[PDB]
Amino acid sequence: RRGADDLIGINAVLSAEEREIRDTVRSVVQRRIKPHIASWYEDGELPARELAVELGELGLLGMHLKGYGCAGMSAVAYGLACLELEAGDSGIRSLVSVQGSLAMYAIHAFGSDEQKDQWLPDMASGHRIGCFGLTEPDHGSDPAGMRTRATRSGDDWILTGTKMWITNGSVADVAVVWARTDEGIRGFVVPTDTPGFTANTIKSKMSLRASVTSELVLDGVRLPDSARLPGATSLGAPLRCLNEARFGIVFGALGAARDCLETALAYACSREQFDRPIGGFQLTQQKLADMTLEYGKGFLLALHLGRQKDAGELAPEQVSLGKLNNVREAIEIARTARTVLGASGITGEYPVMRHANNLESVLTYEGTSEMHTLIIGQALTGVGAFR
Amino acid sequence: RRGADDLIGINAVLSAEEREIRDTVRSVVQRRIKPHIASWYEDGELPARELAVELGELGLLGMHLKGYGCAGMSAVAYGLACLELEAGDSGIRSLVSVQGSLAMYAIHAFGSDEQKDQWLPDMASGHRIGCFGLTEPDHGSDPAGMRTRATRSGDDWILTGTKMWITNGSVADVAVVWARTDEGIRGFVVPTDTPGFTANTIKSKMSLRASVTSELVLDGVRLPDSARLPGATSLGAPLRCLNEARFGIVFGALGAARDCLETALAYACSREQFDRPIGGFQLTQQKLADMTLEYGKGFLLALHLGRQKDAGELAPEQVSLGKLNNVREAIEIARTARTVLGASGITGEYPVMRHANNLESVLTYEGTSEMHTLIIGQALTGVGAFR
Amino acid sequence: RRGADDLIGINAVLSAEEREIRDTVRSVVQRRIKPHIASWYEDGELPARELAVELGELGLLGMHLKGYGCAGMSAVAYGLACLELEAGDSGIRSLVSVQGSLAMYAIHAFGSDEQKDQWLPDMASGHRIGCFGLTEPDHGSDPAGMRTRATRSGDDWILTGTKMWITNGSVADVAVVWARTDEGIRGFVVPTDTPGFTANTIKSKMSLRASVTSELVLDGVRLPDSARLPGATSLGAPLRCLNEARFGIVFGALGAARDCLETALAYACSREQFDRPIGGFQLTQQKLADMTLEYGKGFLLALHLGRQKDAGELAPEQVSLGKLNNVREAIEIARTARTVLGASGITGEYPVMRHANNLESVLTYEGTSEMHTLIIGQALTGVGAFR
Amino acid sequence: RRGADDLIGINAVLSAEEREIRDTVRSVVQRRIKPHIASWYEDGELPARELAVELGELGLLGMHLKGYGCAGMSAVAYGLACLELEAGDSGIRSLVSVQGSLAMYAIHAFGSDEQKDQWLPDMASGHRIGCFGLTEPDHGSDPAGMRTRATRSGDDWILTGTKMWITNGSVADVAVVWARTDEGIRGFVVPTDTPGFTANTIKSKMSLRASVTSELVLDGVRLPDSARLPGATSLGAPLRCLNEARFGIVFGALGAARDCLETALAYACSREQFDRPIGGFQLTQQKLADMTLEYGKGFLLALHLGRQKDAGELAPEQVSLGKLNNVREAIEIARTARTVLGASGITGEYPVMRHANNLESVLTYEGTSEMHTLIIGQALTGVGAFR
Ligand SMILES: Cc1cc2c(cc1C)N(C[C@H](O)[C@H](O)[C@H](O)COP(=O)(O)OP(=O)(O)OC[C@H]1O[C@@H](n3cnc4c(N)ncnc43)[C@H](O)[C@@H]1O)c1[nH]c(=O)[nH]c(=O)c1N2
Ligand SMILES: Cc1cc2c(cc1C)N(C[C@H](O)[C@H](O)[C@H](O)COP(=O)(O)OP(=O)(O)OC[C@H]1O[C@@H](n3cnc4c(N)ncnc43)[C@H](O)[C@@H]1O)c1[nH]c(=O)[nH]c(=O)c1N2
Ligand SMILES: Cc1cc2c(cc1C)N(C[C@H](O)[C@H](O)[C@H](O)COP(=O)(O)OP(=O)(O)OC[C@H]1O[C@@H](n3cnc4c(N)ncnc43)[C@H](O)[C@@H]1O)c1[nH]c(=O)[nH]c(=O)c1N2
Ligand SMILES: Cc1cc2c(cc1C)N(C[C@H](O)[C@H](O)[C@H](O)COP(=O)(O)OP(=O)(O)OC[C@H]1O[C@@H](n3cnc4c(N)ncnc43)[C@H](O)[C@@H]1O)c1[nH]c(=O)[nH]c(=O)c1N2
Ligand SMILES: [Cl-]
Ligand SMILES: [Cl-]
Ligand SMILES: [Cl-]
Ligand SMILES: [Cl-]
Ligand SMILES: [Cl-]
Ligand SMILES: [Cl-]
Ligand SMILES: [Cl-]
Ligand SMILES: [Cl-]
């Protein structure tokens, strides 16, 4: 029996430095996440604040950023880290994506030196948690239509609106909030203790239950001009953040896929029915071959994109190739794997249903499958088809 | 806007009697199931005993059986009832399938007059709950390999083994248990208070959470010969029961599909993005068209099979056409529908994730997709390919 | 071994009258089409004029029309006839569709009594061949944009434009030609000997090679006002004709599917590999089950639509369900069947490649898959998404 | 507008040497193959002998072999060459695959020095054409079951049997023929002028029409022992040859895909319907995105396998990943591309139907999709499921 990674030949196309980072994160996941995750997911509650500190002190927050206590690792090493985190759980990887590639990235890329120096080192250590308030109840795929507004009042700004589906929102110390102004989209560094700001936890989730997801109500929150991100002057600012986060998801989704594929492979060799291992039936082999193919193609695509990113050669339409492909192929792998487990596959004895349900959120967030199709389509044709 | 049933033209191919039964069950579901189901599913607990009484007193237990207080309705009317029940929830329809088409059916078909007279009227009223113990930890798709044994001891039988994944097991008054004997497979009517018999509820389910699913331990349970089902003399007896239950699932799965499709259709007309209803985008219309097609083809297949069943013309390989097709197409409808809802689709605000997760169990139980493929294949070729 | 029709149970849902018509057409196909079709297809040439006479004298032209020597058969019987014709070859069924459901239908529905009396009886006998000139080089899916014009000159009309992909065009005696005028779309009965009218046969076809497909050049063709179809006053006139033809295709495509499925079933039982019939392998059974399911669902959909049509209950969006589904599922059946035949499947020893290539034209013509998706989508949502 | 190769970023992961070879072969294809291929394919006839000389003198026969006038290029460069050849036509690439990776390879790997010195330089120049006789009428996927026999007669061998579907057979000077003997499978270098040897061209092909495909009849062909390949002592010998040829197909199939994708991309930008380029509709963009993804994933898989092959790290189950994936994804690309062209796509004005029909043979030969599934399955599970 050859495992999927062995059959694909993954280690041989990575460096020793990359493999070391991957191995380090895998060990963190096996030790600190996997023993608890079934319970956190079932309960829909996790010690998010304590976990952020743990992960930050381990060097896992802001991994792809430079300075301020961050790891400054390569795009490929960061990708491998995300893959390992998500093999643990997509909710856990989501906490990390929002912290580093959304909230910290926004401050790193568009913030004043005062904002960077105030927030980034404590965010890298996990002692202060961020969130990224873009989506609203009525505006998700079309953030250009956002209705949260920032209006001037003397030297201050007044922020009024509601953000929805905001990861980490209820446990966040700081919110990077996007708003429309009379001169275009702007972003603000919003301490969550500011009067007028409330965060409400979303309950009854059937996906991403080991993550905090919130409504943010900005009920006329008054901020000084110094709270504005000076470098953010258009919708392109939040979109640059999304493209950073999307890259991590390109790798991350493959971790959930891998965990499911490995589960199905092991089960197909151990479980017998009709006097042979179920892996000895053609219909089982078809599934295992198909899943291994999409995992391997997805990994080679992710690695290619990461190598391009490190070389400085990576556009949003290229990231969209990876995001469109790897998330939908991952969720199909999870679904197929569950069928191989039969009834055993319907409980948290195995990770497959958790992965499959989690991947519903990953499929939708950071641009739906349709959004990525249209981004790629526009690149290929020169014609937008969003409207 | 035309709804899916209107576009397909369903009412015109049903009788007034059939439509009345359908409407009656729909009203029961809307009144007695839908207001509570989100909570029952989340909690993984429901008042199963009280619900059985409610459903029985409403005429909904043993619907397709004749006599003993049962409705004696046609195959088509029974199918429509199952569709409505499952549009409520597959777990609820499962409680009903096990009660009527498995446990009562077995007694009705193979029982002595003493067994029928003792058990069936109280089962039809819901005052006594049954379960059907075929599957074991190591034998599911291949029940011919079952290892639960029944051995003679004087005039008594001693039953020893474990059954697993048994719907209603922990709340059952009576268990119809299948065992191997020196002269072939036999079935027994096992009061669950018999010494040596225990039932343990399976927890941590990610599917069918509004149903009771159990392990049955038969630790040398001593029964008189009068507990044996006299008419059951081979594996064909439990298989006849499965074919009755499978028929109800052929219709039932379409109810979960319908509920999801209707949800997606309504949302596509109400939700706007990029300044139009999302139903005004081609990619949305593709989904809605594809889902409506598979729902309608699945319904026409179910109706055809039901008409054959009423005419006396329905073989197991024909039932397998419906079971193979309608469950996998239903789960694909649920999955696709969830994508149309975006983030809103990930909570129990909408029924789609519950339906999709429930359908995992329906896909596996009563013969997996692979089993039905091989049943149809053997019919088409004359050659078995199970081994 | 049960054949697909036997497993589905088709004869039991048809009348004796319907079965008789079906059987009669099957015999015509077996005797007059199947012995020659491989040669006609390879050559890309067939005795179309002689064949039209044969088919007309057999009662097969204008089958669903009433009067003028036409059969006046039901929608269901007509459908079954089309299925049998296409099981022979889609090109042959195309000749018939254009003759009856397009060219004759247009005259029957919108013509003057003079036009009907002049043309229809000789068209029903096959002694005069029609064609239906809607599509142009630059306008296919959007016939509202057609640029062929009809302009008044005294009491005459002058028709100027080019029609393209016109079945029967080079062998037609009469062309029903659609044109834009200052008062909307109009249709004309155009004798093909009219000065200025030329028809050029399209060559190098890789599909529908046993059909004549042509360019029509109307180079200022002068016609009296009596050539205008008086009842045709908008784009809805040619669209009504298309909806008649589409209905026949709903059934027709299933004939090509059936022929391929039957071929694969027979081969799977006869061909041995690895010491068993290839039908004894699970992967083969998967294909045979899947194909049989889509054939049967497609047939039940077609029959349902035909029963609605006879009852007067059939809208264009309902026809589109059948056209969208049955053509794409038929072509997938043909493709899958070819794989079962291995190398033997690549020559005209078997009909599968001819059917698969023919179905490319059927998938595109009478509204592409995308057009039908959007017709169904608009019906479901109330919102057009063509633009 | 970004082309597919540009969007994927292919040149940046190749060397200048690799790009030069690719470019050289592309120019040969554009100049010597593309102007004639529509006619050769339609006619089912090509100047195969003259073409072999042309290709050999250009260095394109035996590209991956060392010595004897062969190019000795890397696995990656050879792959790129095959991709370019097949973008021309799969039939043409097939002539090359059989010449180099089957017939020459067999002699190179298992032949005596006398055989190598006699045959290989004239095969590399194209002045002598080879074929590879493994498949028989009744044994294709299971060559272990072959019935062509070689029996000893004094110091001679007598070869008796029929080989079928043999590329280049009717134009071959030499046939590498596999036979069963009393001591296992053996291979023979068979001059085609040997008495008793006849080759018959297979006609009525609907695929690979620009290739010669033949029946070989070995009617008691008498050969000296020196005709035996000394190094071939089991079924593993012909299988090693297949694994060499399969590798070239992993790349080759992507060339047919590319040509189709490029065709669809150009057409989507040029063709207007409903007042916009058809590439401006969402359903068109979905197709273009999906095709580009599978082309790019397939290319990254091929390149990965080629890099492994050059490093000495490439097993048959790894080759099977590429063969299974790239051929079925290529044929799906061709099919999808044809739909984008509408009616224009059904003639040889565009290359898509030729590519799609050619790929039917590529899907089947060198191991069917099912064979590759089972090779991968056995590697993953340790259990064979062929029987
Ligand atoms: C658990 C979780 C966590 C988060 C988030 C979501 C979830 C579920 N998101 C929000 C996420 O980014 C958001 O859900 C997506 O952008 C999709 O937006 P909507 O859900 O509003 O769907 P929306 O209403 O946009 O779309 C609904 C459906 O219509 C389709 N559609 C929309 N426009 C279309 C068009 N023009 N053409 C074709 N189809 C179209 C969509 O693809 C989708 O299928 C978030 N956000 C945030 O700011 N910060 C965060 O931390 C997170 N985290
Ligand atoms: C919630 C719920 C509720 C119930 C039940 C299940 C569940 C999940 N069932 C049990 C159910 O019938 C059982 O799960 C199925 O028969 C499948 O058996 P296993 O789960 O053991 O899978 P099993 O181990 O048989 O199969 C595992 C996988 O291997 C495949 N496979 C097996 N044999 C194969 C072959 N020869 N060729 C190809 N593939 C093959 C299967 O298709 C599946 O994908 C049950 N039972 C009962 O007796 N009473 C009840 O009330 C219920 N209720
Ligand atoms: C062999 C044969 C025979 C005939 C015919 C065709 C063929 C191949 N037809 C013509 C046929 O009706 C025509 O090909 C189709 O209507 C499609 O039009 P075009 O080929 O111009 O494609 P067109 O250019 O319209 O479309 C090209 C592609 O773009 C897509 N597309 C177009 N608009 C779109 C939109 N708004 N949104 C999304 N996608 C869109 C299409 O679905 C297609 O995939 C015909 N005609 C006739 O009048 N009489 C006849 O007898 C016949 N017979
Ligand atoms: C144009 C062209 C050109 C060539 C060739 C073919 C063609 C079409 N081939 C022959 C080719 O290698 C051969 O067609 C394939 O190996 C498949 O064998 P059969 O066609 O006999 O199908 P076969 O009869 O083996 O299989 C029929 C079907 O059954 C399936 N099947 C078979 N066994 C199965 C199993 N155990 N489980 C599941 N499914 C199974 C197959 O996958 C296939 O779908 C060839 N050969 C050669 O020696 N030299 C050459 O040059 C060429 N060239
Ligand atoms: Cl991050
Ligand atoms: Cl746009
Ligand atoms: Cl029941
Ligand atoms: Cl069997
Ligand atoms: Cl007709
Ligand atoms: Cl529109
Ligand atoms: Cl070669
Ligand atoms: Cl084997």
Q: D98 CB near a chain C CB, below 8 Å?
A: no
Distance CA C373, CA C366 (A): 13
Which amino acids of D are annotated catalytic? 366
Residue tagged 């070989």 (tokens): D216
**Chain C residues with CB-CB distance to B321 below 8 A:** 7-8, 292-293, 296
Please tell me what DSSP assigns to residue B136.
B
On whether the CB atoms of residues B88 and B29 are closer than 8 A, the answer is yes
DSSP conformation class of D266:
H
CA pair distance D18, C47, nearest whole angstrom: 54
D36 Rama sector, left if φ>0, alpha if ψ -120 to 50, beta otherwise: alpha
Put simply, the chain C residues between 312 and 341 with a CB less than 8 A from any chain B CB are 313, 317-318, 321, 324-325
- Comparing CA positions, the residue from B350, B138, B151, B174 lying closest to residue B263 is B350
CB–CB of A345/B206 below 8 Å? no
CA D280/CA A385 separation, integer angstroms:
6
- For residue C131, the SS3 value is strand
Same-domain check for residues A223 and A345? no
Using a CB-CB cut-off of 8 Å, the residues of chain A touching B203 are 347
Tokens 């119809």 appear where?
A: B176
Tokens of B99: 């009660």
Based on the fold, state whether residues D265 and D383 are members of the same structural domain.
yes
Strand partners, D158: D151, D222
A247: domain CATH number? 1.20.140.10
Give B271 to chain C, closest Cα distance, Å: 12
The answer to whether residues B75 and B248 touch, using CB atoms and an 8 Å cutoff, is: no
Amino acid identity for residue C34 in this structure: K
Give the residue whose CA is nearest to atom 36 of ligand 3: C386
Atom of ligand 1 minimally distant from the CA of A366: 12
Whether B297 sits inside 8 A of C292 (CB atoms) is: no
Please answer whether residues B288 and B268 qualify as being in contact, where contact means their C-beta atoms are separated by less than 8 angstroms: yes
Residues from chain D contacting residue B280 (CB–CB below 8 Å)? none
Q: Which residues of A touch C283 (CB under 8 A)?
A: 282-283, 286
Are C137 and C124 contained in the same domain? no
Residues having CB closer than 6 A to ligand 1 are: A 98, 132-135, 140-141, 165-167, 208, 213, 361, 364-366, 368, 370-371, 386; B 271, 273-274, 278, 281, 283-284, 339-340, 342-343, 346
The b/e string for D357-387 (b: 16+ C-beta within 10 A; e otherwise) is bbbbbbbbbbbbbbbbbbbbbbbbbebebbe
Q: Which of D267, D261, D334, D257 is nearest to D84 (CA)?
A: D257
Say whether both B280 and B349 belong to one domain: yes
Running DSSP on this structure, what letter comes out for residue B101? I
* Residue A162 backbone phi and psi in degrees, to 5: -125, 130
Distance CA D300, CA D100 (A): 24
What is the residue range of A210's domain? 130-233
Asked if A314 and A322 count as a contact pair (C-beta separation under 8 A), the reply is: no
Q: Which chains touch C (3 or more CB pairs under 8 A)?
A: A, B, D
Domain end point (choices B199, B233, B267): B233
- For residues A29 and A63, state if they share a domain: yes
Q: What is the rounded CA–CA span in Å between residue C191 and residue C200?
A: 16
For residues D218 and D180, the answer to whether their CB atoms sit within 8 Å is no
Task: Give the CATH number for residue B208.
Answer: 2.40.110.10
Q: How far is the CA of C140 from the centre of ligand 9 (A)?
A: 21
Task: List all residues 6 or more positions away from D113 whose beta carbon is below 8 Å from its beta carbon.
Answer: none
Shared domain for A15 and A109, answered yes or no, is yes
Quick one: residue C47, left, alpha or beta (phi over 0 = left, psi -120 to 50 = alpha)?
A: beta
Query: Are B125 and B71 spatial neighbours (Cβ–Cβ below 8 Å)?
Result: no
Ligand 2 binding pocket includes B370 (Cβ within 6 Å): yes
> C91: helix, coil or strand?
helix
- Cβ C187 vs Cβ C218: under 8 Å: no
Secondary element (H or E) of residue B176: strand B174-181
Do D193 and D258 belong to one domain?
no
Amino acid residing at D350: Y
CB of C278 shorter than 6 A to ligand 4: yes
D69 and D123 housed in the same domain: yes
Instruction: Calculate the alpha carbon distances from C151 to B254, C133, C158, C225, D12 in Å.
Output: 55, 17, 5, 11, 59
The alpha carbon of B367 and the centre of ligand 2 are apart by a number of angstroms equal to 6
Nearest CA in chain B to C311: B12
Q: What ligand 2 atom has the least distance to the C-alpha of B371? A: 42
Q: Are residues D224 and D238 in the same domain?
A: no
Backbone Cα Rg of chain B? 21
C334-367 residues labelled b (16+ CB within 10 A) or e (exposed): bbbbbbbbbbbbbbbebbbbbbbbbbbbbbbbbb
CA–CA separation, A135 and A177 (whole Å): 10
Backbone angles phi, psi at B222, to 5 degrees: -95, 125
Q: How far is the CA of A339 from the centre of ligand 12 (A)?
A: 23
- Return the SS3 of C294: helix
- Judgement on whether residues C37 and C95 belong to the same structural domain of the protein: yes
Distance between CA atoms of C150 and A67, rounded to whole angstroms?
74
Measured distance between the N- and C-terminal CA atoms of chain B, rounded to whole angstroms: 50
List subunits contacting chain A, requiring 3 or more Cβ pairs under 8 Å: B, C, D
Q: Report the residue among C132, C368, C375, C376 best suited for mutation to probe ligand 3: largest number of ligand atoms under 8 A from its CB.
A: C368
Q: Could you say which ligand is closest to the alpha carbon of residue D214?
A: 4
Smallest Cα distance from A241 to chain D, Å: 21
Nearest-angstrom CA–CA distance, A380 and D266: 10
Write out residues 174-193 of A within 8 Å (CB-CB) of D: none
Q: Is C281 helix (H, G, I), strand (E, B) or coil?
A: coil
Q: What is the DSSP string of C211-249?
A: S-EEEEEEEEEEEEGGGB-TT--STHHHHHHHHHHHHHH
Q: Which residues contact A384 (CB under 8 A, 6 or more apart)?
A: A374, A378, D280
Based on the domain organization, do D303 and D175 belong to the same domain? no
- What is the spatial distance between Cα B28 and Cα B11, in angstroms, rounded to a whole number? 20
Ligand 3 proximity of C365 Cβ (cutoff 6 Å): yes
Q: How close is the nearest chain B Cα to the Cα of D284, in Å? A: 10
- Give the phi and the psi of residue A313 in degrees, each rounded to 5: -110, 20
Q: What are phi and psi of D289, to 5 degrees?
A: -65, -50
Method: X-ray
Q: What does the block give as tokens for D143?
A: 């060559």
Distances from the Cα of B298 to the Cα of B6, B257, B323, B379, C298, angstroms: 15, 10, 10, 21, 10
What backbone phi and psi angles, to 5 degrees, belong to B224?
A: -70, 160
Q: How close is the nearest chain C Cα to the Cα of A285, in Å?
A: 10
What Å distances lie between residue B380 and A284, B315, B320, C3, C329, CA to CA? 21, 13, 12, 6, 19
To test the ligand 4 pocket, which listed residue (C267, C272, C284) has its Cβ within 8 A of the most ligand atoms?
C284
CA B93 to each of CA B26, B99, B255: distance values in angstroms, whole numbers, following the listed order: 13, 10, 10
Alpha carbon distance A349, A347 (integer Å): 5
Task: Please give the Cα distance from B300 to B294 (Å, whole number).
Answer: 10
Please list every residue in chain D whose beta carbon sits closer than 8 Å to the beta carbon of residue A379.
1-2, 7
Ligand approaching nearest to the C-alpha of B274: 1
Say whether B349 is catalytic. no
Give, as one character, the DSSP assignment of residue A312.
Answer: T
Q: In sequence order, what E strands does chain C have?
A: 130-133, 149-153, 156-167, 174-181, 184-191, 197-201, 213-224, 272-273, 276-277
Check residue D125 and report its DSSP letter.
T
Check CB contact of B100 with chain A, cutoff 8 Å. no
Measure the CA dihedral A218/A219/A222/A225, to 10°.
40
Per DSSP, chain B holds a count of helices (H) and strands (E) of: 13, 9
Query: What are the residues whose beta carbons fall under 8 Å from the beta carbon of A115, sequence distance 6 or more?
Result: A107, A189, A229
Rounded Cα distance, A266 and D260, in Å: 40
Identify the domain boundary among B233, B251, B277.
Answer: B233
Domain C-terminal end among B200, B233, B266: B233
Total residues found in chain D within this entry: 387
Contacts of A27 (CB under 8 A, 6+ apart): none
CA distance A191 to chain B (A): 26
CATH number of the domain enclosing A116: 1.10.540.10
Closest in D205, D342, D370 to C346, CB measured:
D205
What tokens were used for B315?
């073989």
Pairing of strands B272-273, B276-277: antiparallel
- Both structure tokens of B110: 């193979």
Query: Does A254 lie in the same domain as A384?
Result: yes
Characterize D327-344 residue by residue with b for buried, 16 or more Cβ atoms within 10 angstroms of its Cβ, and e for exposed: bbbbbbbbbbbbbbbbbb
Specify whether the backbone of A175 is left (phi greater than 0), alpha (psi in -120 to 50) or beta. beta
Q: Give the nearest ligand 3 atom to C137 CA.
A: 21
What's the number of domains chain D is made of?
3
